[PDB]
């Protein structure tokens, strides 16, 4: 669990803190990454290995990790900051744990495609397939984060980039089966058995690393997202 | 000279003498130089000569 | 330098005797002969390997002896269709494979495949460029060999590559250096070969094969006298194109 | 046996430098620590040193 305040606030052209602080086990000998998603879009990474960010995000946004804490700086915030921000860390337990989410309130190609909803079914079973093309799918890793409607982000699987080891959440353990295709590029998630609790949209991550967080603890990083299928899962 | 646990203690002192013959009458101390960080069982020294 | 040449020429023997063909060498090798048989036609097939162990698929009838500078084969068993030349190769000097005018025997008087491609007339325009391709074993562990055969000459070597594992250098022959470059392509598992500056004896019909495996380390538990050796560590002959010169 | 490291080749097969560090608690006396921090020298005033 990664403590996390649920709502901040800040005025245009002044400088915010985001901390997001946790245990010893998985923000202190790991590194955290940041995320923001846009109301009704899909997340983007934005702090890397702490020290480090991507072409896509500008300079403007300061992070760093002081023991076990991380804080998230917005150093001049505009009005299009107004989104939910994650921390991400990955606990030697083989989980990977998110954050709570900011609500920063203001007071002024790569292509990730997934399908398969409708009828869930919850007892029976059913297909959930992600493509993918254009980025070098043998190298780059994947994973599985869901996000219920009003609620976080949940992390379901993850499959390293050779097809080898893969690991399972604590409350999916046991019932998903995640495989991948080398020749046909796509991204296959076997869901059996789905509880009335797993009303989310299933977002298909993609991983900037090649084998799992395990061994690369300083590496590992979801930049390009994708529009997950909302599933209907009811009585 | 010692041989302590941790530390060599190398002492030294550089005194005047004029009377030539042999170890002079006077009372001088040895003011520590360099203690040697090194842990060795020595049992035996040699002096070098040119 | 090692010439091996064979004793027998035509053995024209009836079905239902025994046969004998004897080969010698001028020095003194080790237990590094190795039996083929070649249809005509076809492609040749290693019959026995190290003079110790046979192969696997061929019957039992090919029972072989000999060691040091004498070597020879004991079929005591009926020909049923073993209308075939039976060649011989020393396995001793790996960057000198060479082969002997093996004797034509008369009657009286599999997921592993490889294909070629490249042939036709060669006067007009001296530079050829053949193939490779391989869709059985996995391409990059093994070395690729190549092996021509001149019109009722027999068996010549030409030159390997090595694999990618014991350095990528090469080594051809004394009539080939310098006008035959091989290069391989493991990123697409096709092997190629450059023909530059050919010439009228260069006619032959060229065959690529495997080599020796670079990880040992399955060679170690299993021993050398079963079909797993002979599956996974040893050469695979396949098909053979044609070259055509005028004037 | 040789790698045989290329560019043309995709992530996993590319050279990975590892600098792997170890520490041992021998006999003899630690001559590596750690940086010391230090602190601003005060003047006469009833503080801990």
């Keep these: 669990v990664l403590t996390q305040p649920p709502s901040a606030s800040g005025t245009p052209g002044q400088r915010v803190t985001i901390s997001c602080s946790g245990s010893s086990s998985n923000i202190g000998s790991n590194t955290v990454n940041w995320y923001q998603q846009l ?24 992070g760093s990790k002081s023991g076990t804490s991380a804080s998230l700086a917005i150093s001049g915030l505009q009005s299009e900051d107004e989104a939910d921000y994650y921390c ?67 992390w379901v699987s993850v499959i390293s980039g050779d097809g080898g080891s893969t690991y399972y959440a604590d409350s999916v353990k046991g019932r998903f089966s995640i495989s991948r295709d080398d020749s046909k590029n796509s991204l296959y998630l076997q869901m059996n058995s789905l509880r009335t609790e797993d009303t989310a949209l299933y977002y298909c991550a993609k991983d900037r690393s090649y084998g799992p967080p395990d061994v690369f603890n300083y590496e590992y990083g979801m930049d390009v997202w994708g529009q997950g299928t909302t599933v209907t899962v009811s009585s | 000279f010692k041989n302590i646990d941790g530390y060599f203690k190398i002492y030294s002192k550089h005194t005047p003498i004029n009377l030539e013959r042999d170890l002079p009458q006077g009372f001088s101390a040895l003011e520590p130089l360099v203690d040697l960080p090194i842990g060795i069982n020595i049992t035996r020294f040699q002096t070098l000569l040119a | 330098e090692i010439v091996l040449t064979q004793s027998p ?44 162990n046979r192969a696997t698929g061929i019957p039992a009838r090919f029972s072989g002896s000999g060691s040091g500078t004498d070597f020879t084969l004991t079929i005591s068993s009926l020909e049923p269709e073993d209308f075939a030349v039976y060649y011989c190769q020393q396995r001793s000097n790996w960057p000198q494979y060479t082969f002997g005018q093996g004797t034509k025997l008369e009657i009286k008087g599999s997921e592993v495949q490889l294909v070629e491609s490249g042939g036709g007339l060669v006067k007009p325009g001296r530079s050829l460029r053949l193939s490779c391709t391989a869709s059985g074993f996995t391409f990059g562990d093994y070395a690729m060999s190549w092996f021509r055969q001149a019109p009722g000459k027999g068996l010549e070597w030409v030159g390997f590559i090595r694999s990618k594992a014991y350095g990528g250098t090469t080594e051809y022959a004394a009539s080939v250096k310098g006008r035959f470059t091989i290069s391989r392509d493991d990123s697409k598992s096709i092997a190629y070969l450059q023909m530059n500056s050919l010439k009228t004896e ?5 065959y690529c094969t495997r080599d020796r495996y670079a990880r040992y380390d399955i060679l170690t538990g299993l021993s050398p006298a079963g079909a797993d ?3 996974y560590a040893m050469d695979v002959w396949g098909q053979g194109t044609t070259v055509t010169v005028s004037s | 046996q040789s790698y045989g490291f290329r560019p043309t080749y995709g992530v996993g097969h590319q050279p990975y430098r590892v600098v792997v560090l170890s520490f041992e608690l021998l006999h003899a006396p630690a001559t590596v620590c750690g940086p010391k921090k230090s602190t601003n020298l005060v003047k006469n005033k009833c503080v801990n040193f």
């Design chain 1, 39 to 62: 109301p009704g879009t899909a997340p983007k990474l934005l702090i890397y290995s702490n020290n480090q960010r991507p072409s896509g995000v500008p300079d403007r946004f300061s």
């Design chain 1, 88 to 154: 991400a860390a990955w606990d030697d337990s083989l989980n990977w744990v998110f954050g709570g989410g900011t609500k920063l309130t203001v007071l002024g190609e790569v292509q990730l495609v997934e399908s398969g909803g409708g009828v869930v079914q919850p007892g029976g079973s059913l297909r959930l397939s992600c493509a993918a093309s254009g980025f070098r799918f043998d190298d780059h890793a994947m994973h599985w984060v869901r996000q219920a409607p009003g609620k976080g982000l949940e």
């Design chain 3, 9 to 52: 020429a035509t053995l024209s023997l009836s079905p239902g005797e025994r046969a004998t063909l004897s080969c010698r060498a001028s020095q003194s090798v080790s237990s590094y002969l190795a039996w083929y048989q070649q249809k005509p036609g076809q492609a040749p097939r290693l019959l026995i390997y190290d003079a110790s």
């Design chain 3, 202 to 206: 260069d006619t032959a019909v060229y």
């Design chain 3, 229 to 231: 050796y002979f599956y």
